[PDB]
A paper describes a structure:
In addition to these, Centers for Disease Control and Prevention detected resistant polymorphic mutation PB2-H357N in A/turkey/Minnesota/833/80 (H4N2) while testing nonseasonal influenza viruses from their collection. According to the yet unpublished data, this strain is naturally resistant to pimodivir and mutation H357N conferred approximately 100-fold increase in EC50. Mutation H357N increased polymerase activity and showed enhanced pathogenic phenotype. For the H357N mutant, the enthalpic and entropic contributions were less favorable of 0.5 kcal.mol−1 and 2.5 kcal.mol−1, respectively. Phenylalanine/tyrosine 404 and histidine/asparagine 357N create the π–π stacking interaction with pimodivir as well. The RMSD values for ligands referenced to the PB2-WT are PB2-F404Y–0.12 Å, PB2-M431I–0.16 Å, PB2-H357N–0.29 Å. The H357N and F404Y mutations caused a considerable loss of the stabilization “free” energy for water molecules 1 to 4. W2 and W3 became even repulsive upon the F404Y mutation. These changes resulted in a larger decrease in binding affinity of pimodivir to PB2 upon the H357N and F404Y mutations.
Numbering used by the authors: 320 to 490
């Protein structure tokens, strides 16, 4: 509808709709989180200083992320935000230790920001447990492995790196 900020990226919804439904989820540390799950199919653009992306998602499901970034670190930053934003069970179950993050005032962060801060600290467990898949047509986009190196054979599930800037899909 209108643009919002998450993880250093401006997001804008380009199509679709969702409704919030409260769900209780267990983390990989058996901590209960109360998350307002977005239910529906939606498409987004993401813009950051060093990466842009197209995000297509459904209820707790990253269907596809196409990322264009300056370097491996910048691409990884966009992927992490997209994986948290997806609200996938896979991402919740990749949490290690308990989440009790607070802001500058002593106020507990909301669960989505708990998750974001967690995986922005270290995404290695998230990347290693997300899943990989074989990729075929590499003419327009290539794969990225859990170690953030390129591949023309495999990729993180639903993740592709564009061989071009993304104005063509933003238009
Ligand atoms: O425009 C904004 O509000 C923000 C949001 C969207 C992208 C940046 C980070 C978040 C942006 N802020 C700024 N970007 C930039 C900027 C430099 N090179 C870039 N390349 C791509 C890009 F996209 C933004 C930038 N410079 C100063 C900024 F202040
Ligand atoms: O839901 C919220 O509390 C906030 C915080 C956590 C993620 C977004 C940015 C901060 C969120 N804000 C917004 N989310 C959404 C939104 C649509 N579909 C989604 N699927 C998963 C998700 F996670 C957030 C969304 N749209 C507009 C927003 F403005």
């Amino acid at each position: 509808s209108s643009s919002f900020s998450f993880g250093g990226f401006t997001f804008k919804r380009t199509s679709g709709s969702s409704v919030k439904k409260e769900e209780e989820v267990l983390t990989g540390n058996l901590q209960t989180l109360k998350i307002r799950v977005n239910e529906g199919y939606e498409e987004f653009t993401m813009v950051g200083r060093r990466a842009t992306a197209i995000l297509r998602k459904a209820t707790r499901r990253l269907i596809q992320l196409i990322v264009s970034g300056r370097d491996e670190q910048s691409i990884a930053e966009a992927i992490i935000v997209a994986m948290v934003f997806s609200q996938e069970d896979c991402m919740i179950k990749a949490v290690r230790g308990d989440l009790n993050f607070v802001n500058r005032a002593n106020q507990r962060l909301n669960p989505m920001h708990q998750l974001l801060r967690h995986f922005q600290k270290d995404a290695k467990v998230l990347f290693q447990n997300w899943g990989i898949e074989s990729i075929d047509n590499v003419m327009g986009m290539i794969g990225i492995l859990p170690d953030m190196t390129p591949s023309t054979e495999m990729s993180l599930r639903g993740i592709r790196v564009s061989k071009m800037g993304l104005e063509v899909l933003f238009q």
